[PDB]
């Protein structure tokens, strides 16, 4: 048992990059993080771009600190209006130390009510859709990503990867995040505040 | 239009594969994604992602694109005479060949790169390059187009090359469209890899 378990939540029609860019970063700190791919049913889950990934069921541990990671994608359109799924998420949040979302994953966290009275963001293309669902969230329009306590939310796919490296900086130290960037040859925009895509909407 | 044969093997690099898949998979009227491996079934990435694959299958009703990622797995995989011949067999049959990272160590081993301009990630440049002196390796490039062959360096190069490929093949507007809808910041310059500096 290491320090952290990352519970990567997959569901039907998740966005491929929302999940895999961050995984590429977390999956390169294997003495720090236990990667756990979960979904409501276990088995293979298909992304919106047709990749099928093996997953398992969420299990509780008193024992290890848990980071819940919640991606976006088409599938949120229907997952928001699925009470049973939203209960699932809330169950998992109640138990996690850290909570991370990319894109419309924040719509799901919003529905679970965990972001009420919290600063958070979502991708710019879906900003209206997401935000108008919940007023009690201190939505932030322009940010690439927002940290609010132990909650980290981000916008589109670039922001989601850059946020993850930011999360590593916060948690493991910036020297580590840079080492990862350099070794996989990923260009990291450390600025979390100006999303150039906020512009066209 | 095209079937993209994305070749997985044990310990592939996750982002080598899923960055480009995000792009291609956003043009589902132009490309059909087909994840293959030598055995079929589940293949695991170096980051522990298990992805389902099928066996390669011949079709002559559709043009094919062969996509080859890098990752740790390539060090062992350059040895598989069969694997390499498998690739060559597939290359012989494809309209385009694309690689990211050490994927080009494998393309090279198939000798497909002999006489061609090509690149690979900067961190592994020595190791890849010394395997074959008959390839015209380009050190400073993020990616390199030589004919119907496209090779890329690191993970960001991998995605930006895929958008460049979409531009070449389908038109630049479609490329910008995708990048804007998924909100991916696309670095269009294929020429100066900042990671060349390190090595």
TrEMBL record, chain A:
Alphabetized UniProt keyword annotations: Hydrolase, Protease
Gene Ontology molecular function: peptidase activity
Any Pfam family the entry gives: DJ-1_PfpI
CDD domains per UniProt: GATase1_PfpI_2
Any Gene Ontology biological process: proteolysis
Residue ranges of every copy of the DJ-1/PfpI domain listed in the record: 5-169
SUPFAM superfamilies documented for this protein: Class I glutamine amidotransferase-like (SSF52317)
Protein name: Intracellular protease/amidase related enzyme (ThiJ family)
UniProt source species: Clostridium acetobutylicum (strain ATCC 824 / DSM 792 / JCM 1419 / IAM 19013 / LMG 5710 / NBRC 13948 / NRRL B-527 / VKM B-1787 / 2291 / W)
Taxonomic lineage of the native organism: Bacteria, Bacillati, Bacillota, Clostridia, Eubacteriales
Automatic annotation (TrEMBL), chain B:
Keyword Ribonucleoprotein: no
Membrane spanning residue stretches: none
DJ-1/PfpI domain segment(s): 3-167
Pfam families named in the record: DJ-1_PfpI
GO biological process assignments: proteolysis
UniProt KW keywords: Hydrolase, Protease
Keyword ATP-binding recorded: no
PANTHER family found in the cross-reference section: ARAC-FAMILY TRANSCRIPTIONAL REGULATOR (PTHR43130), THIJ_PFPI FAMILY PROTEIN (AFU_ORTHOLOGUE AFUA_5G14240) (PTHR43130:SF15)
Name this polypeptide is given: Intracellular protease/amidase related enzyme (ThiJ family)
Organism, scientific name: Clostridium acetobutylicum (strain ATCC 824 / DSM 792 / JCM 1419 / IAM 19013 / LMG 5710 / NBRC 13948 / NRRL B-527 / VKM B-1787 / 2291 / W)
Highest classification ranks of the organism: Bacteria, Bacillati, Bacillota, Clostridia, Eubacteriales
